Amino acid sequence: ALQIPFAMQMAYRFNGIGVTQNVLYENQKLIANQFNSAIGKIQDSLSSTA
Amino acid sequence: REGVFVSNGTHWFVTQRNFYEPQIITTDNTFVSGNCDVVIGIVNNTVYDPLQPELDSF
Ligand SMILES: *[C@@]1(O)O[C@H](CO)[C@]2(O[C@@]3(O[C@H](CO)[C@@H](O)[C@H](O)[C@H]3NC(C)=O)O2)[C@H](O)[C@H]1NC(C)=O
Ligand SMILES: *[C@@]1(O)O[C@H](CO)[C@]2(O[C@@]3(O[C@H](CO)[C@@H](O)[C@H](O)[C@H]3NC(C)=O)O2)[C@H](O)[C@H]1NC(C)=O
Numbered sequence: 001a002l003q004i005p006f007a008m009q010m011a012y013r014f015n016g017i018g019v020t021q022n023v024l025y026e027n028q029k030l031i032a033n034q035f036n037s038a039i040g041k042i043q044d045s046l047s048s049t050a
Numbered sequence: 051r052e053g054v055f056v057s058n059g060t061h062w063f064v065t066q067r068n069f070y071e072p073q074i075i076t077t078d079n080t081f082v083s084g085n086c087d088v089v090i091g092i093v094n095n096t097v098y099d100p101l102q103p104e105l106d107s108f
């Protein structure tokens with residue numbers, strides 16, 4: 001297990017999907033907010049939707 | 051471009067992600083994107099370009 005800062009790893013993965021890595025770093029706060037809110041939505045979906 | 055910036059404490063290099071083969075940071079293996087007020091984790095260093103020594107020899 002070789003550790004990378006999670007931001008740099010997310011940049012690796014953006015390079016994986018074809019988007020260049022600067023797109024993440026320039027937009028890191030926005031991407032973090034999207035991920036956090038998206039995880040938040042799962043809790044509502046699980047707790048409320050039967 | 052491809053790889054990561056790694057420092058052995060006091061000198062910055064570019065390596066490929068899977069085999070430590072260090073190379074000096076230069077303009078032909080790093081690209082540029084805007085200024086650096088938006089990135090969090092920036093570090094100051096020199097990006098030596100290969101055309102300037104040849105032009106300064108003039
Ligand atoms: C650092 O990790 O890597 C540098 C690679 O350039 C190291 O700096 C050089 O080391 C060689 C070998 O000791 C010397 O012959 C050079 O003079 C020296 N400097 C330059 C500009 O090449 O620099 C550096 O020593 C090393 N630091 C540590 C703590 O490992
Ligand atoms: C890095 O990931 O974490 C560091 C934590 O020490 C961080 O540097 C500062 O450290 C002081 C220690 O008391 C904290 O109070 C600061 O909040 C913290 N700074 C930030 C911005 O969190 O050093 C360091 O900045 C951080 N690096 C990055 C790129 O986020």
Ligand SMILES: *[C@@]1(O)O[C@H](CO)[C@]2(O[C@@]3(O[C@H](CO)[C@@H](O)[C@H](O)[C@H]3NC(C)=O)O2)[C@H](O)[C@H]1NC(C)=O
Nearest residue numbers: 062085086087088089090091092093094095096097
């Ligand atoms: C980086 O390597 O170089 C920047 C350019 O000087 C450095 O930005 C300075 O930061 C100090 C302290 O915050 C300010 O007083 C200067 O006005 C500011 N200079 C400019 C031109 O904006 O910015 C920056 O600090 C430095 N990086 C590190 C880690 O020191």
